Amino acid sequence: SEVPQVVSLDPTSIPIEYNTPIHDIKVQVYDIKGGCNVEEGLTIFLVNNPGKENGPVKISSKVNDKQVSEFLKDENMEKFNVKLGTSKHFYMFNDNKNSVAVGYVGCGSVADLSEADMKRVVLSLVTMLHDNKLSKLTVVFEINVDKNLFRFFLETLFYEYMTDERFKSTDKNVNMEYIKHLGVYINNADTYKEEVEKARVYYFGTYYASQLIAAPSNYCNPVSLSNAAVELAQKLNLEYKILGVKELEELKMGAYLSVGKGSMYPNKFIHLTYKSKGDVKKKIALVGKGITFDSGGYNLKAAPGSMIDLMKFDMSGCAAVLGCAYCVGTLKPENVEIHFLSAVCENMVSKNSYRPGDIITASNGKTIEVGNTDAEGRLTLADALVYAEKLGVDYIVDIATLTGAMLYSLGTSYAGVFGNNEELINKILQSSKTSNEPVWWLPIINEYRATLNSKYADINQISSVKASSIVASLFLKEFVQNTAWAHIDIAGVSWNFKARKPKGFGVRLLTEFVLN
Amino acid sequence: SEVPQVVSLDPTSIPIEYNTPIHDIKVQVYDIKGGCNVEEGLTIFLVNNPGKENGPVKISSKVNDKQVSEFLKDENMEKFNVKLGTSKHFYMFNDNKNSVAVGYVGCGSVADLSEADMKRVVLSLVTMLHDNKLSKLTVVFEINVDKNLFRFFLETLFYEYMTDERFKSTKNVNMEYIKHLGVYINNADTYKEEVEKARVYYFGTYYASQLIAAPSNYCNPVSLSNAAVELAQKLNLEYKILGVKELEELKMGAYLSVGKGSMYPNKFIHLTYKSKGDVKKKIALVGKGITFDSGGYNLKAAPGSMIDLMKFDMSGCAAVLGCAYCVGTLKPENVEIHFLSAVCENMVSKNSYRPGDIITASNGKTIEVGNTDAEGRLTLADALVYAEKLGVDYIVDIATLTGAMLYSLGTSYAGVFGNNEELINKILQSSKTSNEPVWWLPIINEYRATLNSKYADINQISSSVKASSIVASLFLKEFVQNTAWAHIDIAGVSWNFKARKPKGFGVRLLTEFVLN
Amino acid sequence: SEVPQVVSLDPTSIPIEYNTPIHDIKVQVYDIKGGCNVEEGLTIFLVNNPKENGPVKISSKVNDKQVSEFLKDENMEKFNVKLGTSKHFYMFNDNKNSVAVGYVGCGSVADLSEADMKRVVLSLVTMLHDNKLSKLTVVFEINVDKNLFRFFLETLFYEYMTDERFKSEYIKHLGVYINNADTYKEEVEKARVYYFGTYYASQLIAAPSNYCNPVSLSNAAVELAQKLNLEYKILGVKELEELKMGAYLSVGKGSMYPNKFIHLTYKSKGDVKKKIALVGKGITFDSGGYNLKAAPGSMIDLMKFDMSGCAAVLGCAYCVGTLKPENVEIHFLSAVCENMVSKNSYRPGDIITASNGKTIEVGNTDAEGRLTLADALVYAEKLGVDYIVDIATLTGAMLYSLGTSYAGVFGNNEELINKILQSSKTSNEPVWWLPIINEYRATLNSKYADINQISSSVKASSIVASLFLKEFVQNTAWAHIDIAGVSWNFKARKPKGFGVRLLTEFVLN
Ligand SMILES: CC(C)(C)C(=O)N[C@@H](C(=O)NO)c1ccc(-c2cccc(/C(N)=N/O)c2)cc1
Ligand SMILES: CC(C)(C)C(=O)N[C@@H](C(=O)NO)c1ccc(-c2cccc(/C(N)=N/O)c2)cc1
Ligand SMILES: CC(C)(C)C(=O)N[C@@H](C(=O)NO)c1ccc(-c2cccc(/C(N)=N/O)c2)cc1
Ligand SMILES: [Zn+2]
Numbered sequence A: 001s002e003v004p005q006v007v008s009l010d011p012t013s014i015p016i017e018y019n020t021p022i023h024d025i026k027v028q029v030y031d032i033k034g035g036c037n038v039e040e041g042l043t044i045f046l047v048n049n050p051g052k053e054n055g056p057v058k059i060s061s062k063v064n065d066k067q068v069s070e071f072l073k074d075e076n077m078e079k080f081n082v083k084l085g086t087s088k089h090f091y092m093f094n095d096n097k098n099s100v101a102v103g104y105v106g107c108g109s110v111a112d113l114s115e116a117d118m119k120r121v122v123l124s125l126v127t128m129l130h131d132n133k134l135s136k137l138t139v140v141f142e143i144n145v146d147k148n149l150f151r152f153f154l155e156t157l158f159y160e161y162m163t164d165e166r167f168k169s170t171d172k173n174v175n176m177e178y179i180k181h182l183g184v185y186i187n188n189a190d191t192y193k194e195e196v197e198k199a200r201v202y203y204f205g206t207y208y209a210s211q212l213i214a215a216p217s218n219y220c221n222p223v224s225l226s227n228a229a230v231e232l233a234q235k236l237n238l239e240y241k242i243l244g245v246k247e248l249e250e251l252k253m254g255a256y257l258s259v260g261k262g263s264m265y266p267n268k269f270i271h272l273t274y275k276s277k278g279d280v281k282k283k284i285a286l287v288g289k290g291i292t293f294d295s296g297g298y299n300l301k302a303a304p305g306s307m308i309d310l311m312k313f314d315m316s317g318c319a320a321v322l323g324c325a326y327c328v329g330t331l332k333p334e335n336v337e338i339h340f341l342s343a344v345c346e347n348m349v350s351k352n353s354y355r356p357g358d359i360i361t362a363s364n365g366k367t368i369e370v371g372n373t374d375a376e377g378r379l380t381l382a383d384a385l386v387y388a389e390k391l392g393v394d395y396i397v398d399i400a401t402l403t404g405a406m407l408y409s410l411g412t413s414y415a416g417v418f419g420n421n422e423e424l425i426n427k428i429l430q431s432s433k434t435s436n437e438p439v440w441w442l443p444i445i446n447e448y449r450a451t452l453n454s455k456y457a458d459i460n461q462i463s464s465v466k467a468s469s470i471v472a473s474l475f476l477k478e479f480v481q482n483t484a485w486a487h488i489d490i491a492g493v494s495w496n497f498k499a500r501k502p503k504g505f506g507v508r509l510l511t512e513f514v515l516n
Numbered sequence B: 001s002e003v004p005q006v007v008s009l010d011p012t013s014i015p016i017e018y019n020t021p022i023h024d025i026k027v028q029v030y031d032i033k034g035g036c037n038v039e040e041g042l043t044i045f046l047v048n049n050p051g052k053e054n055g056p057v058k059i060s061s062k063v064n065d066k067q068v069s070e071f072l073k074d075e076n077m078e079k080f081n082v083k084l085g086t087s088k089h090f091y092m093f094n095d096n097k098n099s100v101a102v103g104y105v106g107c108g109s110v111a112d113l114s115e116a117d118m119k120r121v122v123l124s125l126v127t128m129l130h131d132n133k134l135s136k137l138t139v140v141f142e143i144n145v146d147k148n149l150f151r152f153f154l155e156t157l158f159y160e161y162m163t164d165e166r167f168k169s170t171k172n173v174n175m176e177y178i179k180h181l182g183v184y185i186n187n188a189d190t191y192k193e194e195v196e197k198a199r200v201y202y203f204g205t206y207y208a209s210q211l212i213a214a215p216s217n218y219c220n221p222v223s224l225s226n227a228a229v230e231l232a233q234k235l236n237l238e239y240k241i242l243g244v245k246e247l248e249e250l251k252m253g254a255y256l257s258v259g260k261g262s263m264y265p266n267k268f269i270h271l272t273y274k275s276k277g278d279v280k281k282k283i284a285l286v287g288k289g290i291t292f293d294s295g296g297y298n299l300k301a302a303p304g305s306m307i308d309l310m311k312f313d314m315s316g317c318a319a320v321l322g323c324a325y326c327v328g329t330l331k332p333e334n335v336e337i338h339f340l341s342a343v344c345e346n347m348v349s350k351n352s353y354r355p356g357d358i359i360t361a362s363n364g365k366t367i368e369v370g371n372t373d374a375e376g377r378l379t380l381a382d383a384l385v386y387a388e389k390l391g392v393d394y395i396v397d398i399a400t401l402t403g404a405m406l407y408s409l410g411t412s413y414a415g416v417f418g419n420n421e422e423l424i425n426k427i428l429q430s431s432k433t434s435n436e437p438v439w440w441l442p443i444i445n446e447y448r449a450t451l452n453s454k455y456a457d458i459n460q461i462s463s464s465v466k467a468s469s470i471v472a473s474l475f476l477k478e479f480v481q482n483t484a485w486a487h488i489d490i491a492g493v494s495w496n497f498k499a500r501k502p503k504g505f506g507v508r509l510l511t512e513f514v515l516n
Numbered sequence C: 001s002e003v004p005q006v007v008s009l010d011p012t013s014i015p016i017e018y019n020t021p022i023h024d025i026k027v028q029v030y031d032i033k034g035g036c037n038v039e040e041g042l043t044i045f046l047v048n049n050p051k052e053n054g055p056v057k058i059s060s061k062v063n064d065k066q067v068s069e070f071l072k073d074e075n076m077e078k079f080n081v082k083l084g085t086s087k088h089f090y091m092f093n094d095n096k097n098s099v100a101v102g103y104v105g106c107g108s109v110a111d112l113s114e115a116d117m118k119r120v121v122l123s124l125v126t127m128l129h130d131n132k133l134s135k136l137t138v139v140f141e142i143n144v145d146k147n148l149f150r151f152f153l154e155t156l157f158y159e160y161m162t163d164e165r166f167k168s169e170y171i172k173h174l175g176v177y178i179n180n181a182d183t184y185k186e187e188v189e190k191a192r193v194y195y196f197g198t199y200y201a202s203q204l205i206a207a208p209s210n211y212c213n214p215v216s217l218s219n220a221a222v223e224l225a226q227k228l229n230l231e232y233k234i235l236g237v238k239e240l241e242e243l244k245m246g247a248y249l250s251v252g253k254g255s256m257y258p259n260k261f262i263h264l265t266y267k268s269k270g271d272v273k274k275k276i277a278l279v280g281k282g283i284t285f286d287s288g289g290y291n292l293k294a295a296p297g298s299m300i301d302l303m304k305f306d307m308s309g310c311a312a313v314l315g316c317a318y319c320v321g322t323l324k325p326e327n328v329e330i331h332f333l334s335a336v337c338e339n340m341v342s343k344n345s346y347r348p349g350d351i352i353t354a355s356n357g358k359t360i361e362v363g364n365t366d367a368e369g370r371l372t373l374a375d376a377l378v379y380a381e382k383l384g385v386d387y388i389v390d391i392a393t394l395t396g397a398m399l400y401s402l403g404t405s406y407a408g409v410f411g412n413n414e415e416l417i418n419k420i421l422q423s424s425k426t427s428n429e430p431v432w433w434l435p436i437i438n439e440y441r442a443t444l445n446s447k448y449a450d451i452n453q454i455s456s457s458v459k460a461s462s463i464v465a466s467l468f469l470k471e472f473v474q475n476t477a478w479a480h481i482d483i484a485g486v487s488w489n490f491k492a493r494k495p496k497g498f499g500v501r502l503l504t505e506f507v508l509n
């Protein structure tokens, strides 16, 4: 629990914001058939024009204001088009001779907005929210969205609107001012109301993960991350257990302990459990990779474009699992028992570091020949997967920033999923659809298994077969003997390079998985 | 004060030679309008021939010896030319039937010798001093030189003549420095004052050279700071060495972070010279003091990164200390100078700061580390804050900051940056009179936006923009709020790659700045 | 004159747009005193706050009650003045006519730099590209001098314009409100000329190497010369051989396009008191030769820009031919060719002879610019001029010294250098003086030839290259502008047309 320091100026905890301005926003949903009141703040219409490549803007909704309705007549609106992402601001006086602000966001010509399309729409909305000191936002849905896409709209809105200033000091934005009210006008309003607070939970689960990932390695270390996990568990009334080095040695986790040998921070194994109130029909282990910093070890990340300054992300999997723990602990699903696992450590260069060539013994007895110290994720997961299977669960799902090869296979939008079981894989893909976090199924090619045959050990850590994501999956598979297991590689999608911030990818995916 | 050791064979101090053979050379300046007597040792004429490429050598000076005068008749000398760097040796008997040695050095056809050509002249002269066991050197100036260039001649003569053998064991058994130096020149009385000034300037440069040439196992933060104290005590300068505890109390998080991975504690050097009368100008001299730059986790592993030379990375501190010698010795009036250096070592360890880390400077600004090898500006940041807190008129820092300097100005000219044109003008003026060439480079504000960090107040390094020297200057500028400041990047000029030794660059420049 | 083809589908000319939509824009300048009329179109206020990202406050009186209500302090303080930040709203004015009103933030500094003004303009152009307006009205509530005001217009015109020559609704009126408007009006038509000179250069640079080759580029120079009544002469291989331009001819040996030396001349009507030669590097594509640009990050796909010096000179020729300066004779020169890999290419190690008799040992075929410039400078000095100014994308080292914003200037004459620096100030194309360090000269000493092409190296490539060029100007005031870093706008993925206005201001002032 006590974080070691080199100097007294070294931080000893991760700064975490639990009460965000988003949580202070009163959200109301009204039915669009009842007409819209356009009074205070900014009122935005989400409008499209089917079969028309940049068609004219037409406001269909009834507006309970003669002056605003007059401004919004088609003859007035025809100068504007519905091109996806396009937005405009309107200034006018309402029936009470009060100044009001009105506008729209273009939703293109396609009647079915993709996950990318809605995100593009949301981003345009946030630009209107930025650099403007509004007290209220009102969104009028003149497009067709189902419950899932509606929830996605809110989640994405909350997440992008929120700004992380935990590490700002002399450069805090002096103009930041969050809205206090959110009004939503939509068709079939009663069906969508339940999605509001679920979206708020999914938001924070994601933002919490984001906070952990964005936190630098001097703030976010194996000890401070594990302390934060306990703190979260206490708040959610979850059972929790943090395994220290002596306990890990007792469990003979030689692979996990080897990676952390060169670190000044002791290894900390996070084990959280949520158990439903009643009959448990499904037991699930969620495993997250928890490398608080990946220097690469003695296989140092020194090659051009290895982005070592980014390697604080290497605990993104752990964050996804912890963010899911928040959502599950808050929404409290029934008939499920969930274990949240993460073998947390740091991969550093030291006199005490494990070397390339070292042979290490996993907790299941298998000896492993280390061919590359920068492939440390699969080593820590190996011991974690063995621990997971001993819990006696039905499904083991691990999520990890495992291989850079994902950038060349799926890129920055789609995570890849591997597994030994098609049913579990199908559930993950189903969860991908409903959570709107895109995942693609990649194969575990058994023909490559022979490249992991070590001359001296039971198995090689790496091949020496480019195909890194597949080989890594073959490695991990060796540590699950008779349990349905799935592996999600998020090395490519975890970090948003365009926005220079984490995505908190996987939180919504895993929560949808546990709930459904 | 006590230097830590790994083994008992690790050195515990920097070997320093204070009394050099150069100091034992008796120097006499005579007026040439009285004629030259050629008796013992070597007598060298510095001769040119204006507007006539490689024209004949002609000795204009009167020689108070009939045979030598006859030997040196124009008819005899016409077979030799005045090409720059050319030297010749003559053997003859004087009026007392004694064997004497005479020769010349060609000084070209240009009437105004450059700083570079004069250096070539000196080297040709020093070559004659080498491999010859002379008791006296006599130099006759038959060229036109002002007081500054004459002083430059002596400094360069002294510095190049001197040989550093502190680390020889086996040492040249055949070395034998002269005990007397005679100079014949017109208006000798005006030039006599330059002799002891040159000797002071010489050692300031050679002292700096000794610190730079000293390897990092000899020259470490503790041993270097100890040396500064010892120097300060000999000069009666006020001195204060700030240790880790004061630095923590002063909240120097940037400086302390760089040294975290080192076995040697950070040591902040603070020397002060105060005049006896009224103080009209207060000056802070800041030197980069990285005793070894491994690059940290951004290891210098790239081809041609020249990590074995990186003991020079404390050249700025050495330059400042060399200046402290000159100022403390010459004792200028009406000035108060603070000699500063945030000394530490940039190493790879379990305790090292990582890429991505956010650290807080002593002025409260948070800094996101994008590259651990850009450590100089971090130590300078806290040092510059400390300097401004002293309430001075001018802040000048000198540092081996950016490798880009080799591509901009190369190895002869250092670059100067600043926030104040007047100060820049003073630095440039000092460059002329000290003959240490410096060129003014711009701080381009358009690049400042690339230092915008998403999470911290500022980025340590840029991403988009090359031109590191300007970007680094933009960084440093953020740590000086309302004081005239200039920054001299000597990364390119500090080491003499051809001669394989330091130049001690900056000592004479800074002293002239302080004196004038 | 005839462009050679490999297949019949290969283009034989550079598509050039002479009549741009910008030329159809009616520009009106009114004095800010007396109030602003908000009638049609979009009205944008340029506002600052002398604090850091302070609230927007509109000082100007607006002769419209509805718009005045919009611009009241209570409404505008919700917005801040962060440089580049903008908001615009659509509303009805007193005449129930649709109008759009907004601002662009100009920061807290009272004196906007050229880079600052560029960010303001870019924010403005984004609104012009996303709005179907017939009229733009810009209200200057900031301090701008005549030069910077002209710069505003030029940059606005340039950024507004879109190059669609290779693809397979602009405003018609521009209103400007500014204090002391009468003093600023003369800058308007000057800006329009400077605009096209820059845009013309941009068109040549942006044109790919299959369109823009030595033949088609020289043809373009003739066509321009004919429109401007400039004297013109294009030297072909046979003339160049008789002139013994061996350095220049060696570089082009490996190309399928014959070398073409462009020589345009502007001569004043009255007495010629000053003669100036402008030399531009004209490499239509730089593959690097046998020293191929194959290293990671060598950006070989960008190397069509390597004729930017020539384009700058030609764009300047337009401005000079249009504005018609007095008492000057200007020669516009470019040794145009292509640096390719072939059985006929010159090899690393080859010793070649320049037109002044100097033999040169080639150490790197990718340092071809200085070879073509060498013969061009000899040709220039033979004309008997007062000033020789060359402009070239010469060394990549400029990216490490001054970066992408400031060009570097080198020279053998201090008066000429300051004139260029003065021109840099008034044209707002930033240039910084870099030294020609004579101590590095010895590194060009060849064992076999008279001189080395490159050092081996004294890293500082930009300085070493200047020393090389310096050897080919014997008794003439000469200056060299390295634009390798500033020529291409990597962020916007387009040329800057850098140097046209700089060179024009030099000739005019
Ligand atoms: C097989 C290899 C050691 C190359 C590997 O896959 N290493 C991963 C690792 O460090 N596991 O612990 C690895 C390497 C790179 C990345 C990664 C992730 C995201 C972005 C990038 C990136 N931008 N590289 O330029 C690189 C992720 C995982
Ligand atoms: C931002 C960057 C890492 C490029 C940088 O400025 N590095 C300097 C540094 O480590 N500061 O602490 C840096 C890099 C190289 C040099 C340097 C200086 C002198 C010679 C050489 C050289 N010849 N390397 O092969 C390299 C000096 C400073
Ligand atoms: C002496 C050397 C071959 C290194 C050189 O300066 N070559 C220049 C050249 O090709 N002259 O004909 C040269 C090299 C690189 C560049 C340049 C310009 C802009 C960008 C880049 C680059 N590498 N972007 O990633 C490189 C410009 C001129
Ligand atoms: Zn790794």
Ligand SMILES: [Zn+2]
Binding pocket: A291, A294, A314, A374, A376, A377, A401, A402
């Ligand atoms: Zn990893």
Ligand SMILES: [Zn+2]
Binding pocket: B293, B295, B372, B373, B374, B375, B376
């Ligand atoms: Zn460094």
Ligand SMILES: [Zn+2]
Binding pocket: B290, B293, B313, B373, B375, B376, B400, B401
């Ligand atoms: Zn350094």
Ligand SMILES: [Zn+2]
Binding pocket: C286, C288, C339, C365, C366, C367, C368, C369
């Ligand atoms: Zn080239």
Ligand SMILES: [Zn+2]
Binding pocket: C283, C286, C306, C366, C368, C369, C393, C394
């Ligand atoms: Zn080129």
